[PDB]
From Swiss-Prot, chains A, B:
Quaternary structure (record): Homotetramer.
Lineage: Eukaryota, Metazoa, Chordata, Craniata, Vertebrata
Protein name, entry field: Peptidoglycan recognition protein 1
GO molecular function, one term: peptidoglycan immune receptor activity
GO cellular component: extracellular region
S-S bridge residues: C6-C130, C22-C67, C43-C49
Domain N-acetylmuramoyl-L-alanine amidase: 28-156
Stated family: Belongs to the N-acetylmuramoyl-L-alanine amidase 2 family.
InterPro entries: Amidase/PGRP_sf, Amidase_domain, Peptidoglycan_recognition, PGRP, PGRP_domain_met/bac
Native source organism of the sequence: Camelus dromedarius
This protein's UniProt keywords: Antibiotic, Antimicrobial, Disulfide bond, Immunity, Innate immunity, Secreted, Signal
Function according to Swiss-Prot or TrEMBL: Innate immunity protein that plays several important functions in antimicrobial and antitumor defense systems. Acts as a pattern receptor that binds to murein peptidoglycans (PGN) of Gram-positive bacteria and thus provides bactericidal activity. Forms an equimolar complex with heat shock protein HSPA1A and induces programmed cell death through apoptosis and necroptosis in tumor cell lines by activating the TNFR1 receptor on the target cell membrane. In addition, acts in complex with the Ca(2+)-binding protein S100A4 as a chemoattractant able to induce lymphocyte movement.
One BP term from GO: negative regulation of cytokine production
A Pfam family this chain is assigned to: Amidase_2
Amino acid sequence: EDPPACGSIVPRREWRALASECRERLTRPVRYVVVSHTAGSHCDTPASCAQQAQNVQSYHVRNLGWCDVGYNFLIGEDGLVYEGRGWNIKGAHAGPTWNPISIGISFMGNYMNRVPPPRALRAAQNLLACGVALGALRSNYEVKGHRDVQPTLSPGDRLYEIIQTWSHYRA
Amino acid sequence: EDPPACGSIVPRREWRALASECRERLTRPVRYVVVSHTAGSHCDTPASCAQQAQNVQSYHVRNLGWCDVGYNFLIGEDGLVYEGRGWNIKGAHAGPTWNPISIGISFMGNYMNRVPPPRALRAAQNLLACGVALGALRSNYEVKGHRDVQPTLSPGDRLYEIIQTWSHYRA
Ligand SMILES: O=C(O)CCCCCCc1ccccc1
């Protein structure tokens, strides 16, 4: 109910996620991948990271009135990937130009003057490979940083310099 | 063989592991996977689990004189996979008949009265799919309990029950 899934992802129900009401779909295979940071509190355990994903979703749903947490996936410093909207549902991370053509993944915390531990970066790339494997991402997939497509500081000076070293990253 | 490397694994250096002195290799592709528990302390965090891996390698090397932590991989309740001897190197987990033909996976903890969390189970299972995709395991590969191939309680009643439900399990 219903998992044989992939790159070890914590499912919605596991992090006590309110149900999603979002219906719009993404046409896979998908082209772009946007990396952002939540700009929120960071966590480094599964217990604290479950709570943080829960907290981010709540702010998005109760306060901004969105159908679900905005990101397709969330990455905690505990080294785990948190299921947001998933591979199929259009996200709300990068504005209306990019939300229907990209998969937004978000690192939990502020990474302006901080860096995510390797395990988080590992989970992230693994997450991405796991995407292609399923057909959601297209192998040619390109990684853009949040600030490359929107006036924002996200994902942070420090995380942004790292993702530039990634092999699939295009400016 | 196949460029696309698989899954997330915490590398030896990251959990501060003593250099291995172990040299006997396994013949790819391995047919059997044997699941054990450590019957030791459990840890739920990246930090506390790295320590535990260290404690276990320590005890195997310093007190029992093995060339390396005996298991090929360890699984923590933090939902992470810790690297041991790896895919290509014979371990010291299940006796001499079995060590040369199987892969040893141990869950860090005593799973007699406790089941490991879903995230632990997810990593263990994902790890195996990675083995198959990498070519280190046989697509048909068979999972066995430690107690099926040795007189032992490992991997613990609770955990034993669970692995019996895996589709690759054969007693
Ligand atoms: O783990 C890997 O990277 C190799 C491929 C594993 C993909 C998950 C297997 C699966 C996918 C969809 C439905 C059931 C199982």
